[PDB]
Amino acid sequence: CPLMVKVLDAVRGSPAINVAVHVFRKAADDTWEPFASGKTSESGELHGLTTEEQFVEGIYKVEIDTKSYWKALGISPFHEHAEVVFTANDSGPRRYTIAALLSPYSYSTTAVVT
Amino acid sequence: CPLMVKVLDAVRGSPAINVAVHVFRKAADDTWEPFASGKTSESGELHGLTTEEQFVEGIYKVEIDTKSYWKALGISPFHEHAEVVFTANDSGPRRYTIAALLSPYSYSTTAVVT
Known about the structure:
homodimer, mainly beta, Immunoglobulin-like, 5-stranded mixed sheet, 4-stranded antiparallel sheet, about 50% strand, globular, transport (thyroxine,retinol) in serum, transport (thyroxine, retinol) in serum, dimeric
């Protein structure tokens, strides 16, 4: 799948399972359309996302519900969510893997394409 | 200052200067209002922001224009910008220091609350 997502937990050294992730597509008008959604797996990964050229180029947004992730634990978090806004589109069909490493007061996001 | 931002460049090992930062305050209606704006200083810092109880309780968004920074450089980044969303004030009027560490395809955001 053209777009994959992976989330890890830096506090426990494990995949961030059961994490909600919504994918928005920047619409015709200045605004955000719901594009895809899922919950991370046992592997902390989300595959079923989108298709080949349902996925076309545009600005996308990956919203990660980190707040819920943390409270589930009993942790006091800082961010409301983790957000990743990218442009899909150079000259190519790629493969986008967005990774996110979660801490209560800190997070990193990285992109790996091919 | 109640709200401070610091931004570093992991590619060059220096403060990220002249990076535009917009601060939004989630308004009465489900929506974002402009609250403060500025650019990072020679030391990668933005202090001019807000004040005492002007800064009120609420959900704010700190949007760092990473895209323009990398472009000015000759680098073609992945992120459109770096967004930081948080609930402020609650159990205290706090002091917020938001740190960002940028790379072309990666960014990390950390918060220091006192």
